[PDB]
Amino acid sequence: RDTASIGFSDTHQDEKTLRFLKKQISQFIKHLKEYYPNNELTKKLVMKYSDVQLLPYTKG
Amino acid sequence: RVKKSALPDKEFPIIETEKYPEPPILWETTIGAPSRLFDRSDGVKYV
Amino acid sequence: GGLSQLVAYGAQDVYLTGNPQITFFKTVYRRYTNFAIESIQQTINGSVGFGNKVSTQISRNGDLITDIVVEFVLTKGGNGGTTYYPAEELLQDVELEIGGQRIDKHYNDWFRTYDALFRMNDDRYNYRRMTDWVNNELVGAQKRFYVPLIFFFNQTPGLALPLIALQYHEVKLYFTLASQVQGVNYNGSSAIAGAAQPTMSVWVDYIFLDTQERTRFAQLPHEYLIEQLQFTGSETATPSATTQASQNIRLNFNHPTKYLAWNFNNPTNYGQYTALANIPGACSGAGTAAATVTTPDYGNTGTYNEQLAVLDSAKIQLNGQDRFATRKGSYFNKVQPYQSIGGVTPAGVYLYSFALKPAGRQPSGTCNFSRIDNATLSLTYKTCSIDATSPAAVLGNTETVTANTATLLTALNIYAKNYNVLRIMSGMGGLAYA
Amino acid sequence: QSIGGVTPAGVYLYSFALKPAGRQPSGTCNFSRIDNATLSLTYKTCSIDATSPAAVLGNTETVTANTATLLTALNIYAKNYNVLRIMSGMGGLAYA
Amino acid sequence: GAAQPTMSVWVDYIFLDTQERTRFAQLPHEYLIEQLQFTGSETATPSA
Amino acid sequence: AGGLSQLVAYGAQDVYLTGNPQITFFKTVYRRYTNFAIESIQQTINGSVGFGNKVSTQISRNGDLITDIVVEFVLTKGGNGGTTYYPAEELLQDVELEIGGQRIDKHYNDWFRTYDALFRMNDDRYNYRRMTDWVNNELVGAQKRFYVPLIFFFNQTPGLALPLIALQYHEVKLYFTLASQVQGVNYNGSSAIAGAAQPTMSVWVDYIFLDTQERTRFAQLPHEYLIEQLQFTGSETATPSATTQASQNIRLNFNHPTKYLAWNFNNPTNYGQYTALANIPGACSGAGTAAATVTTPDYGNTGTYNEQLAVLDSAKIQLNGQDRFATRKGSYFNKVQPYQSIGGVTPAGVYLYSFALKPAGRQPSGTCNFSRIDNATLSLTYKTCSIDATSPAAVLGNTETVTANTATLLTALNIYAKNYNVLRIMSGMGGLAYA
């Protein structure tokens, strides 16, 4: 076996609610931000990244 | 079609291709110190 | 002797006694502010009687208040076995208002649910002694009952309500008395001729602080982290003999919730959270020719025999996703309170905690439902195919079935206990969150 | 003295701890430093006729049922404290 | 007298050659996938 | 708990086993070896094969080295099961090994029987029996193909494979003498079995094919080998009396560093009979009942472990008139010597005396060089033949110093010696350095 990854179901799922939609709407426009995901799709994807923490643990 | 004796026979180099994202470690395990064996020396020359 | 153990010291003890930090043999107690507690009777406005709404304003006798007890003098309208926690049933609800704003509210069913989940052992027994007849009393017997309140300030001195710093705002309690109380003025649906009206009294424990503490409370703004009860009633999907009913109940809860609690019941019979059956204590006359599964043994209304409970299984879904894997009703009934409370919960009453210690005062993990768009309690019911009048069927049955009489448990009560902050500033009270 | 509950007949406890029912250590007997630990037990005389309530219930401190000789198994337990060391993705105990 | 079922689960695996297999292990991947949402409900009962 | 609980229990007394470790047990690296292949090639037998005939074969130059040699025979039963005893072994009366005309060695049917009795064991010995006899109760007329492996020094280990490759100018030959009679095949006791078939025969040699580098080395370099030779002296016994203990001093005309001596007493009429016969199960034809004849063996059960039927009471070996060891009982040679030196079980009537720590192996481990012993002599004391062989009680209940009255039939003694000589090969020729 020997799997060193987390696997605790908390890795990439943005488990917020529709409040996340309000948050992403709190970075681009006021009321109907639709033109921002329609045009800035790559910017809307660069605004969606996960946190990172690493821990090596070398050999003996 | 080539005679078997002139066909290659080496299996897919899977162990050279998987490229696990992180290197392997030394899987150390332990039961801890022999607590009844602490500060006990059986290697004594009779004097 | 003991000296032979002291000398048995090794490297391992470095994590127990090496480099010692504390001892156990010289306790140093804390000095504390000077205070005293006086029990004072309040004036009840309106008119006391069955079905009436009455109220009281808490007098400003002391500086802080904690315990509140509502006392009823009731009489037995029938013999032993005809009542079930009647003082608890009588106090249909209590609403706490400060300065015109609602802070909290408890219901007779909540008191029963609360007790079922959070009190235990002799505490629970003594509680029963203060709300019911427990020595096989006979018709005509008269008793004074004491119903303690369970508002946040009634649970710990730490949350004593600072009447002293609520100089501009009155603190009031509104009490709804039940139109009928089993074994007191009604027997099932039948009125009991000649039944007496209750005599009611409200007692409040007021803490008198000495001058320096008293002055400090009066001059400073304060914030108290308190709990509130949220509650709504729902219709129970009718369980059936032929199908397993299921129901998706949207939970209109908000704030950081410590736990959910719920029960199913027969609204006719206070405290009945389970089906009736012809097994000892499970129905009026159980065990004999006169047994009926249309009326409970009121004195033994609550049980532990899960076979008579309606719920098969349940889960909580948040924003479309499971919060935890589906577990059986007995998980919520027995394991949840084992894990988090340590008492024993009666059949038909369920708990799901979002907190490590929901029974305490210190927050220990909460579910903030104000950040959840859709919080749904998903229930699956057992099939009501067991003939309740036949012990062989009642007691020898399977995991997924229940009594035919479980279809009488048509009411569902869902509760949630949460945190909020009570602000007391410049003589006025109110809550931090809405 | 040490727990605060009720223990059924046939079950015995001897604590080295002030509060054995809790997590915080409060006095321990370190058997890793004891060359010879022994439990010494004396049994009751199994002379009481188990089928006769008069004998079962009216008897003396040092006797028991003749059916007590069926209790031929003995289970001795010891609950102790060790340290679970966890680091660099792996772990084990401080002491064997 | 009814018999109990015999069950087996079979998975059909794709074996990649060297270059493709290397890329799959090393590169990040994103798939647009489908999910089924489902709930059961009581049907209002129709009547004559 | 578990295996780590053993590893942790470490101290001063472990240093002598695991300190400054040299090896492991869990990483075997196999040696690279020269590539080779082995072929079974049938040789041509010159001369007529048949009972009593002498035939021969020259080993062909097909491979580079040779090891195993198997002589096949086909025999037909002249009687029913139980009437034969290792008949293929009995048929091959002798085998003579010669290189370039020099005799290297020579084995006898009795040697094969003694060799097997002493050195093969357990399932190996059984498998051997299966290749030389009928062991599944076959009946008269049954036909069977037997395989009799040769046991010359190069036929026992690859390590002594004979370098035909380096013998470019010398023929390597095997001469085989076939017995005039084989019990239960063409003769039954003293009578011939009319109609018995003549045996067929085939000699098979296992040839090793070497790679170029190894083949070249062998072809040009000189080689020196320690090889084995069998010395053998057959003689008349001091046949025991029914009244006393016969004794005998047998001059042993042996030479060379001897690994061991071995011997047996036998009834020359009945192949493999090293003991007396008696009316006890397996000890004679009809044994155990009224019809038993204690003068006719149960051929299929000729051998036995019942020392009561053996005739050696005691023995010692003298070197130049000096005792080599204290006199020991015949059972000491029969049971202990092979226990110690071989590890198998030796049948009654067969005796071993080793000069070597491990005589059953190739590696020399102590020898008696008889080339330096002017007067080597075997001193024997026989048991008294006073026991009535026809009375099971007389046999089974007797003492240490006595045997069967039928033990007086053990008129022949076969003394063998296995020794080491030096075989040298150079410039295409081979031979043995010492006479």
Coordinates of N, CA and C in Angstrom, one line a residue, chain D residues 6-91:
Chain D
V6 N -20.5 1.5 40.9 CA -20.7 0.2 41.6 C -20.1 -0.9 40.9
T7 N -19.3 -1.7 41.5 CA -18.7 -2.9 40.8 C -19.4 -4.2 41.2
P8 N -19.9 -5.0 40.3 CA -20.5 -6.2 40.5 C -19.6 -7.3 41.1
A9 N -20.2 -8.2 41.8 CA -19.5 -9.2 42.5 C -18.7 -10.0 41.5
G10 N -17.5 -10.4 41.9 CA -16.6 -11.2 41.1 C -15.6 -10.4 40.3
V11 N -15.8 -9.0 40.3 CA -14.9 -8.1 39.7 C -14.1 -7.3 40.7
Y12 N -12.8 -7.3 40.6 CA -12.0 -6.6 41.5 C -11.1 -5.5 40.9
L13 N -10.8 -4.5 41.7 CA -9.9 -3.4 41.3 C -8.9 -3.0 42.3
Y14 N -7.7 -2.8 41.9 CA -6.7 -2.2 42.8 C -6.0 -1.1 42.1
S15 N -6.2 0.1 42.5 CA -5.6 1.3 41.9 C -4.3 1.7 42.5
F16 N -3.4 2.2 41.6 CA -2.2 2.8 42.1 C -2.3 4.3 41.9
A17 N -3.4 4.7 41.3 CA -3.7 6.0 40.9 C -4.8 6.6 41.8
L18 N -4.7 7.9 42.0 CA -5.7 8.6 42.8 C -7.0 8.7 42.0
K19 N -7.0 8.9 40.7 CA -8.2 8.9 39.9 C -8.1 8.0 38.6
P20 N -8.1 6.7 38.7 CA -7.9 5.7 37.7 C -8.9 5.8 36.5
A21 N -10.0 6.4 36.8 CA -11.1 6.5 35.8 C -10.8 7.6 34.8
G22 N -9.9 8.5 35.1 CA -9.6 9.6 34.2 C -8.4 9.4 33.3
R23 N -8.1 10.5 32.5 CA -7.0 10.4 31.6 C -5.7 10.9 32.2
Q24 N -5.7 12.0 33.1 CA -4.6 12.6 33.7 C -3.9 11.6 34.6
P25 N -2.6 11.2 34.5 CA -2.0 10.3 35.3 C -2.0 10.9 36.7
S26 N -2.2 10.0 37.7 CA -2.2 10.4 39.0 C -1.6 9.4 40.0
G27 N -0.5 8.9 39.7 CA 0.2 7.9 40.5 C 0.2 6.6 39.7
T28 N 1.3 6.0 39.4 CA 1.4 4.8 38.7 C 2.4 3.9 39.3
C29 N 2.3 2.6 39.0 CA 3.2 1.5 39.4 C 4.0 1.1 38.2
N30 N 5.3 1.4 38.1 CA 6.0 1.1 37.0 C 6.6 -0.3 37.0
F31 N 6.0 -1.2 36.3 CA 6.4 -2.6 36.5 C 7.6 -2.9 35.6
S32 N 8.1 -1.9 34.9 CA 9.3 -2.1 34.1 C 10.5 -2.0 35.0
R33 N 10.3 -1.6 36.2 CA 11.3 -1.4 37.2 C 11.2 -2.3 38.4
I34 N 10.3 -3.3 38.2 CA 10.0 -4.3 39.3 C 10.4 -5.7 38.8
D35 N 11.5 -6.2 39.4 CA 11.9 -7.5 38.9 C 10.9 -8.6 39.1
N36 N 10.2 -8.6 40.2 CA 9.2 -9.6 40.5 C 7.8 -9.1 41.1
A37 N 6.9 -8.8 40.2 CA 5.6 -8.4 40.7 C 4.7 -9.7 40.8
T38 N 4.0 -9.8 41.9 CA 3.0 -11.0 42.1 C 1.7 -10.6 42.7
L39 N 0.6 -11.2 42.2 CA -0.7 -11.0 42.8 C -1.0 -12.3 43.6
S40 N -1.3 -12.1 44.9 CA -1.6 -13.2 45.8 C -3.0 -13.2 46.1
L41 N -3.6 -14.4 45.8 CA -5.1 -14.6 46.0 C -5.4 -15.7 46.9
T42 N -6.4 -15.5 47.8 CA -6.9 -16.6 48.7 C -8.4 -16.7 48.3
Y43 N -8.9 -17.9 48.1 CA -10.2 -18.2 47.7 C -11.1 -18.6 48.9
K44 N -12.4 -18.4 48.8 CA -13.4 -18.8 49.9 C -13.6 -20.3 49.9
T45 N -14.1 -20.8 51.0 CA -14.4 -22.2 51.0 C -15.8 -22.4 50.3
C46 N -15.7 -23.3 49.3 CA -16.9 -23.6 48.4 C -17.7 -24.7 49.1
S47 N -18.4 -24.4 50.2 CA -19.2 -25.4 51.0 C -20.7 -25.1 51.0
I48 N -21.2 -24.0 50.4 CA -22.6 -23.7 50.5 C -23.4 -24.3 49.4
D49 N -24.5 -25.0 49.9 CA -25.3 -25.7 48.9 C -26.1 -24.6 48.1
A50 N -25.7 -24.4 46.9 CA -26.1 -23.5 46.0 C -27.6 -23.6 45.7
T51 N -28.2 -24.8 45.9 CA -29.6 -25.0 45.6 C -30.5 -24.7 46.7
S52 N -30.0 -24.3 47.9 CA -30.7 -24.1 49.1 C -30.6 -22.6 49.6
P53 N -31.5 -21.7 49.3 CA -31.5 -20.3 49.7 C -31.1 -20.1 51.1
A54 N -31.5 -21.0 52.0 CA -31.2 -20.8 53.4 C -29.6 -20.8 53.6
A55 N -29.0 -21.7 52.8 CA -27.5 -21.8 52.9 C -26.9 -20.7 52.1
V56 N -27.5 -20.4 51.0 CA -26.9 -19.4 50.0 C -26.9 -18.0 50.6
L57 N -28.0 -17.6 51.3 CA -28.2 -16.3 51.8 C -27.9 -16.2 53.3
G58 N -27.9 -17.2 54.1 CA -27.6 -17.2 55.6 C -26.2 -17.5 56.0
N59 N -25.3 -17.6 55.0 CA -23.9 -18.0 55.2 C -22.9 -16.9 55.7
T60 N -21.7 -17.3 56.0 CA -20.6 -16.5 56.5 C -19.7 -15.8 55.5
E61 N -18.9 -14.9 56.1 CA -18.0 -14.1 55.2 C -17.0 -14.9 54.4
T62 N -16.5 -16.0 55.0 CA -15.4 -16.8 54.3 C -15.9 -17.9 53.5
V63 N -17.2 -18.0 53.2 CA -17.6 -19.1 52.4 C -18.4 -18.7 51.2
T64 N -18.5 -19.6 50.2 CA -19.3 -19.4 49.1 C -20.0 -20.6 48.6
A65 N -20.7 -20.5 47.5 CA -21.4 -21.6 46.9 C -20.5 -22.7 46.4
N66 N -21.0 -23.9 46.5 CA -20.2 -25.1 46.0 C -20.1 -25.0 44.4
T67 N -20.9 -24.2 43.8 CA -20.8 -23.9 42.4 C -19.8 -22.9 42.0
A68 N -19.1 -22.3 43.0 CA -18.1 -21.3 42.8 C -16.8 -22.0 42.3
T69 N -16.8 -23.4 42.4 CA -15.6 -24.1 41.9 C -15.7 -24.2 40.4
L70 N -16.7 -23.7 39.8 CA -16.8 -23.7 38.4 C -16.1 -22.5 37.8
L71 N -15.8 -21.5 38.7 CA -15.1 -20.3 38.3 C -13.6 -20.5 38.1
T72 N -13.3 -21.4 37.2 CA -11.9 -21.8 37.0 C -11.0 -20.9 36.2
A73 N -11.5 -19.9 35.6 CA -10.7 -19.0 34.9 C -10.4 -17.7 35.6
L74 N -9.2 -17.2 35.5 CA -8.8 -15.9 36.1 C -8.2 -15.0 35.1
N75 N -8.8 -13.8 35.0 CA -8.3 -12.8 34.1 C -7.7 -11.6 34.8
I76 N -6.4 -11.4 34.6 CA -5.8 -10.3 35.2 C -5.3 -9.2 34.2
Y77 N -5.8 -8.0 34.4 CA -5.6 -6.9 33.6 C -4.7 -5.8 34.2
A78 N -4.0 -5.1 33.4 CA -3.3 -3.9 33.9 C -3.3 -2.8 32.9
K79 N -3.8 -1.7 33.3 CA -3.9 -0.6 32.4 C -2.7 0.4 32.7
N80 N -1.9 0.7 31.7 CA -0.8 1.5 31.8 C -0.6 2.6 30.9
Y81 N 0.4 3.5 31.1 CA 0.7 4.6 30.3 C 2.0 4.5 29.5
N82 N 2.0 4.8 28.2 CA 3.1 4.7 27.3 C 3.0 6.0 26.5
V83 N 4.0 6.2 25.6 CA 4.0 7.4 24.8 C 4.0 7.0 23.3
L84 N 3.0 7.6 22.6 CA 3.0 7.4 21.2 C 3.6 8.5 20.5
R85 N 4.7 8.2 19.9 CA 5.6 9.2 19.2 C 5.3 9.2 17.8
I86 N 4.9 10.4 17.3 CA 4.5 10.5 15.9 C 5.3 11.7 15.3
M87 N 6.0 11.4 14.2 CA 6.7 12.4 13.5 C 7.2 12.0 12.1
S88 N 7.3 13.0 11.2 CA 7.8 12.8 9.9 C 6.9 11.8 9.1
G89 N 5.6 11.7 9.4 CA 4.7 10.8 8.7 C 4.6 9.4 9.3
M90 N 5.3 9.1 10.4 CA 5.3 7.8 11.0 C 5.3 7.8 12.5
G91 N 5.0 6.6 13.1 CA 5.1 6.6 14.6 C 5.1 5.3 15.2

